[PDB]
From Swiss-Prot, chains A, B:
Top enzyme category: transferase
Cellular-component GO terms for this entry: cytosol
Name under which the protein is recorded: 2-C-methyl-D-erythritol 4-phosphate cytidylyltransferase
Miscellaneous: There are no coordination bonds that occur between IspD and magnesium in any of the complexes examined to date.
Pathway: Isoprenoid biosynthesis; isopentenyl diphosphate biosynthesis via DXP pathway; isopentenyl diphosphate from 1-deoxy-D-xylulose 5-phosphate: step 2/6
Length: 225, 225
């Protein structure tokens, strides 16, 4: 039972950066929706016993997918921001000791990256995330201007990706505390950070992209080909 | 003569992150090398009168390209690091008032992005660069560990791309000074920054990628399709 993992997939975003009245997670690549691609990647690993998917209360396309009746899938309503949807998913996680949180919008997840992340439960007490090294020179803009303030050192700088793997109750409590104290939480690692922890960085493939913009769809298809 | 622009293309990298004994800039996409794609993008704009390409002293494939005999192209030897190759190119720029520096490895440059960058000479005294907003949550790693120190705010954070457009002598002098004082210079904007300036950020397409890794080739082809 120690190895059992519960997954949480925040998929309640309206994605108004997609322009289309059709959510990005519901767009299709091959014979499946982006959401299904993401969920099947998690279900592909033996340890992932359950997947909790958080959707919008006004979401009516989920019930029309094969996942709707899957014995390992549980559906709950998400919240205003990603962190809220993730929290609602965590509350239905169960007794699982460890939780995997993965964006519905990242359908290109490979099994090797996933297995390497999952190994953290046997070598870590706080958990970690998949991540990709920064390549371009990075620039910090001036507060209210489109001019360069200074360069941000790309060395030691990483792109946070998902899944993000953490002990269930610890993540639950850190996220609740951060949100209650009105902190800025853009991922799960951010919640552990707010509570004083420092999650591990597990290098994953950079082709594990997030589909948010219209063009992202085409690119995601390319990678899945 | 005020509008005349000289371009500098650093292409002296051995690219040992490509694995192949064949430099990334010399790989082919369609009926052309990556280098030719990059150079033609600059030559496509009327203002770009000359292009100085910096290559490795041991580079023997350049002379076998059609660009070798192009009336607008000048070839010089590059240096140990990118900043050195760029400096050598600048010394052969001529009397051009403004210089455009573009990585040989970024063949997906679009004309609209280029024209918007070039407009800076009529609205700026210091210049600017093409850049793309950061999307993922960013993480700063701990000095000697693969653990997260803290999150780096993605708001106001940009991916520096190229071309980078600056007054010729100013760039020349700032780069010389920075290099002499042993500063870290990963792009041209960094040199103006070292001398106290703050270049403008011009949003460009994120598909204007840099080909450094083996897989980058395939992706670049996709974008050029
Ligand atoms: C977690 C990271 O991938 C780490 O780089 C990013 O911080 C996510 O950044 P992001 O701006 O939150 O990205 P988005 O594409 O808007 O959202 C990622 C996932 O959160 C979900 N989401 C977003 C807002 C919301 N109220 N409920 C949600 O369930 C989206 O449906 C999507 O599957
Ligand atoms: C300028 C930026 O694109 C801004 O994001 C990056 O800072 C460049 O970062 P980078 O690590 O320098 O990237 P690379 O792919 O190794 O180099 C970009 C360009 O510099 C050239 N280059 C590199 C090293 C060297 N001694 N001479 C060169 O002329 C390469 O040939 C390539 O066309
Ligand atoms: Mg959002
Ligand atoms: Mg280099």
């Amino acid at each position: 039972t120690h190895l059992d993992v519960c997954a949480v997939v925040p998929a309640a975003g309206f994605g108004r950066r997609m322009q289309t009245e059709c959510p990005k997670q519901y767009l299709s690549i091959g014979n499946q929706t982006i959401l299904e691609h993401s969920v099947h990647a998690l279900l592909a690993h033996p340890r992932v016993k359950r997947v909790v998917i958080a959707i919008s209360p006004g979401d009516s396309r989920f019930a029309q997918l094969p996942l709707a009746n899957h014995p390992q899938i549980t559906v709950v309503d998400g919240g205003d921001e990603r962190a809220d949807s993730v929290l609602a998913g965590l509350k239905a996680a169960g007794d699982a000791q460890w939780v995997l949180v993965h964006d519905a919008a990242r359908p290109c997840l490979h099994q090797d990256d996933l297995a390497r992340l999952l190994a953290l439960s046997e070598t870590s007490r706080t958990g970690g995330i998949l991540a990709a090294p920064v390549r371009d020179t990075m620039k910090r803009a001036e507060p209210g201007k489109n001019a360069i303030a200074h360069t941000v050192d790309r060395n030691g700088l990483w792109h946070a990706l998902t899944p993000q793997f953490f002990p269930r109750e610890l993540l639950h409590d850190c996220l609740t505390r951060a949100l209650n104290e009105g902190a800025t939480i853009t991922d799960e690692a951010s919640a552990l950070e707010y509570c004083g922890f420092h999650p591990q960085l597990v290098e994953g493939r950079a082709d594990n992209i997030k589909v948010t913009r219209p063009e992202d769809l085409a690119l995601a298809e390319f990678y899945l080909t």
